[PDB]
Amino acid sequence: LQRARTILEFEKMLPEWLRSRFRMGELCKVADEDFRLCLRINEVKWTEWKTHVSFLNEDPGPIRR
Amino acid sequence: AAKMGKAEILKYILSREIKEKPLRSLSRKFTDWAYGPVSSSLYDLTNVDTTTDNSVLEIIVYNTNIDNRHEMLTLEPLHTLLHTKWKKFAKYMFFLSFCFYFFYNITLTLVSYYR
Amino acid sequence: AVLIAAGADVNAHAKGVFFNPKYQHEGFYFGETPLALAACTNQPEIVQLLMENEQTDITSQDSRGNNILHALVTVAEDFKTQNDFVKRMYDMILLRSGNWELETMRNNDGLTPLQLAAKMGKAEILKYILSREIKEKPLRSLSRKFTDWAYGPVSSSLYDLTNVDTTTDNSVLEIIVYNTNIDNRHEMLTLEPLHTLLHTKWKKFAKYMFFLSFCFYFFYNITLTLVSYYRPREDEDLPHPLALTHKMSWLQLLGRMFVLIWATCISVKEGIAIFLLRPSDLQSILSDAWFHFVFFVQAVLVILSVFLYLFAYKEYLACLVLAMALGWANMLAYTRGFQSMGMYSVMIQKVILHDVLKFLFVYILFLLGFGVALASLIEKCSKDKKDCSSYGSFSDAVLELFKLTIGLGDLNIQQNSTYPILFLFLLITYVILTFVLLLNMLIALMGETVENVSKESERIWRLQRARTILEFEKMLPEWLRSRFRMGELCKVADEDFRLCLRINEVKWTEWKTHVSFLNEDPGPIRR
Amino acid sequence: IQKVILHDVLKFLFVYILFLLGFGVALASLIEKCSKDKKDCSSYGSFSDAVLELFKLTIGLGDLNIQQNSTYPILFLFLLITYVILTFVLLLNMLIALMGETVENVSKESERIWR
Numbered sequence: 001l002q003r004a005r006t007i008l009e010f011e012k013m014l015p016e017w018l019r020s021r022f023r024m025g026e027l028c029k030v031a032d033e034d035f036r037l038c039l040r041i042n043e044v045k046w047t048e049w050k051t052h053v054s055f056l057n058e059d060p061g062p063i064r065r
Numbered sequence: 066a067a068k069m070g071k072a073e074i075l076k077y078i079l080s081r082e083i084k085e086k087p088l089r090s091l092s093r094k095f096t097d098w099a100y101g102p103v104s105s106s107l108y109d110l111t112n113v114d115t116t117t118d119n120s121v122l123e124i125i126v127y128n129t130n131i132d133n134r135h136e137m138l139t140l141e142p143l144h145t146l147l148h149t150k151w152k153k154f155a156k157y158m159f160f161l162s163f164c165f166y167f168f169y170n171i172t173l174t175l176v177s178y179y180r
Numbered sequence: 181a182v183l184i185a186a187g188a189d190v191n192a193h194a195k196g197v198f199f200n201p202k203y204q205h206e207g208f209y210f211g212e213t214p215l216a217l218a219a220c221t222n223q224p225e226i227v228q229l230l231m232e233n234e235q236t237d238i239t240s241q242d243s244r245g246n247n248i249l250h251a252l253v254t255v256a257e258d259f260k261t262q263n264d265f266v267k268r269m270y271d272m273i274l275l276r277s278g279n280w281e282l283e284t285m286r287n288n289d290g291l292t293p294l295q296l297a298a299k300m301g302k303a304e305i306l307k308y309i310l311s312r313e314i315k316e317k318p319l320r321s322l323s324r325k326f327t328d329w330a331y332g333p334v335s336s337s338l339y340d341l342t343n344v345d346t347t348t349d350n351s352v353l354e355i356i357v358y359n360t361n362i363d364n365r366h367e368m369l370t371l372e373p374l375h376t377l378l379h380t381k382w383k384k385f386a387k388y389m390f391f392l393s394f395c396f397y398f399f400y401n402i403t404l405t406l407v408s409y410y411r412p413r414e415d416e417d418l419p420h421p422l423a424l425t426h427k428m429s430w431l432q433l434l435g436r437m438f439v440l441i442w443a444t445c446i447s448v449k450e451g452i453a454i455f456l457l458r459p460s461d462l463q464s465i466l467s468d469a470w471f472h473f474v475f476f477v478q479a480v481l482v483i484l485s486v487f488l489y490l491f492a493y494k495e496y497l498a499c500l501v502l503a504m505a506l507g508w509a510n511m512l513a514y515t516r517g518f519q520s521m522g523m524y525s526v527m528i529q530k531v532i533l534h535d536v537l538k539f540l541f542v543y544i545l546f547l548l549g550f551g552v553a554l555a556s557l558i559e560k561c562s563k564d565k566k567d568c569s570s571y572g573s574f575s576d577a578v579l580e581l582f583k584l585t586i587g588l589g590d591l592n593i594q595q596n597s598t599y600p601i602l603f604l605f606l607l608i609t610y611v612i613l614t615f616v617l618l619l620n621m622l623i624a625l626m627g628e629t630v631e632n633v634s635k636e637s638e639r640i641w642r643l644q645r646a647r648t649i650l651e652f653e654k655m656l657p658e659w660l661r662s663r664f665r666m667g668e669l670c671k672v673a674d675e676d677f678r679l680c681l682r683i684n685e686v687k688w689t690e691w692k693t694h695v696s697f698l699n700e701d702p703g704p705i706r707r
Numbered sequence: 708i709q710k711v712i713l714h715d716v717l718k719f720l721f722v723y724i725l726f727l728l729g730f731g732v733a734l735a736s737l738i739e740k741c742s743k744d745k746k747d748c749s750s751y752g753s754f755s756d757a758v759l760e761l762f763k764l765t766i767g768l769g770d771l772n773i774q775q776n777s778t779y780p781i782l783f784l785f786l787l788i789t790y791v792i793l794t795f796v797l798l799l800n801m802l803i804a805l806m807g808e809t810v811e812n813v814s815k816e817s818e819r820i821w822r
């Protein structure tokens with residue numbers, strides 16, 4: 001918490017155009033039209049094996065090419 | 066959920082995996098690709114980081130009145146995002162503020178002891 | 181099974197930018213054979229399906245030279261974060277079709293899959309690989325364990341020991357002891373063929389080669405002590421670092437050539453020992469190569485005193501006195517052989533790293549910080565005892581304030597200047613800061629760690645005497661007459677009488693009829 | 708009181724004597740100096756004086772002096788602050804933490820041993 005109190009203070013006292021992008025920007029959600037709402041990436045591990053129904057891409061790990 | 070301090074409803078609101086496909090639009094979570102036990106999750110982040118006014122990271126950090134702030138920053142879109150914002154601009158802006166202040170007190174020290 | 185009967189390729193090796201290093205990046209190194217991710221992703225029914233197919237290869241290597249078994253070793257991580265099917269997927273694939281040929285196979289970088297359990301640090305698969313009791317008699321040949329005789333609750337076990345002890349190159353005891361990169365070394369030496377074998381190798385040659393190295397070094401520092409306290413001095417500024425006595429009564433001639441030989445021999449031995457392993461700046465230079473480093477600092481520091489005699493510096497006594505104080509403090513290394521002092525020598529080693537090193541950075545910041553403030557008041561043109569020839573600088577305000585932690589004498593708040601209810605204020609600020617707050621942190625902080633470390637301080641000590649036995653055995657270039665083992669005792673085969681063995685014991689529970697046995701119930705050798 | 712003269716201070720007194728004797732000879736090899744301590748013709752300043760001036764640093768001594776002594780007194784001051792860091796703040800404070808672990812381990816069965 002105590003280093004969380006400083007990061008939101010330095011980011012508030014940084015009046016640039018905020019070039020530092022922390023996030024995947026404008027990556028697609030599941031819709032025919034709604035391509036918005038910039039995103040984040042994390043990882044999962046071993047248990048609870050199941051067939052995977054909902055997915056976004058045809059199994060790459062990074063961006064394709 | 067943030068300002069009242071209700072932690073258990075806030076663990077649900079950030080993930081909210083929706084299995085059924087006709088209404089997967091309203092989820093805050095998407096499995097990008099799986100291939101087995103190494104799947105790449107993806108959180109929504111539309112009202113979380115300080116990019117608008119009064120976002121849910123700015124409430125839960127700056128707040129009084131709650132004894133449950135330090136536990137609620139364990140949650141997943143709030144946890145990795147503080148790691149990223151530390152990684153690319155805070156680590157310098159903290160160590161430069163250290164260097165601007167460690168060099169400050171030496172200049173106050175030498176002028177009031179030596180001469 | 182439709183696609184298998186259709187005629188798909190069962191042996192297709194998928195290369196690419198998976199098996200990426202950094203598991204976080206895309207990453208699923210599983211071997212790349214189609215048999216492997218059947219076994220790797222916990223699919224036991226389809227493991228049976230691929231093994232029934234006669235077209236399926238089992239022996240086929242991969243991009244890293246790895247077979248089926250090298251891949252299945254390097255995915256386990258724990259018992260906790262898995263159902264532990266890797267132990268039974270390992271067993272299902274050997275018995276289904278297996279000779280020794282699939283086990284002995286080395287990979288691209290020349291590494292047995294037994295050794296791959298060691299260097300990767302997979303502990304749970306390594307408990308299985310050393311025992312591996314095989315019940316069914318047509319394939320008891322591939323076991324690493326044999327019940328010799330039972331007679332009830334006192335049965336005599338027997339471990340295989342074919343690639344374990346340092347009798348070949350790069351054996352699984354030599355990996356797991358000398359290794360960095362793992363936090364799981366001290367737990368893995370609890371396992372049975374690794375545990376009793378260190379007890380045997382300690383019993384017959386290490387106990388002497390450790391206590392003789394103690395006697396060769398305790399008698400060393402006394403000869404360095406007496407020559408630099410009793411007779412350095414004769415009347416002039418003649419340097420004379422190690423006394424000679426060219427005249428009769430051969431004592432200092434014998435004493436000088438005693439030190440200069442043993443200082444060189446302890447330098448060349450450690451100078452090759454430190455030029456074997458590369459630490460990384462912390463945590464590996466501080467645990468395994470610390471007393472390799474402390475001896476080497478002492479050894480160069482003694483032979484440097486000879487070159488202080490070369491053309492007569494001023495440092496011939498001031499350097500050699502540092503070798504004496506450090507020469508007694510590293511005697512605390514050689515009390516590693518004892519048991520009860522062994523646990524004490526890790527709870528003194530860990531708390532100079534964990535609790536007082538955090539302390540000395542905080543305490544110096546208060547020592548220096550209040551140090552300048554009292555020094556800025558002390559000047560006063562009245563400073564301390566007629567300040568014309570006397571003192572009263574900054575360091576005097578450190579020596580009058582470092583002495584407030586221990587007994588000083590009289591704490592004076594007298595003749596000093598402009599506002600002595602500020603000079604009295606910063607003094608009682610300092611005693612409240614570090615006499616009653618910041619020193620008494622340390623007893624409470626040490627009290628938390630020594631009940632956190634001394635639940636596993638024993639096994640860390642077992643590692644530290646394991647680091648010495650494999651060093652003395654490596655520095656013993658004889659023909660190794662000391663036999664630690666039953667030699668060439670028979671395995672269960674018509675022809676294969678080889679693979680020298682080991683003996684251990686079992687006790688009361690789980691009563692059963694004894695099927696597999698080697699002899700008709702003797703306890704020792706017959707006759 | 709009977710078990711901790713066997714279990715904790717007996718490990719202590721072997722380690723502390725090794726630092727008492729070990730730094731004892733090193734300060735004794737510097738103290739001689741032909742200036743040793745208060746007109747060294749009839750007076751003293753042998754090895755045991757460098758033990759009595761250094762056994763007294765555990766308890767109250769009087770004045771710790773770093774004065775008139777010889778060739779490099781930023782080594783004589785260095786070994787003194789080496790000793791106080793070794794046994795005033797490290798090796799004595801082991802013992803309270805070590806005793807604190809045993810008397811909650813023995814005093815669950817200290818009654819029956821008394822019986």
Ligand code: NA
Nearest residue numbers: 624627804807
């Ligand atoms: Na305590």
Ligand code: NA
Nearest residue numbers: 587588767768
């Ligand atoms: Na005192």
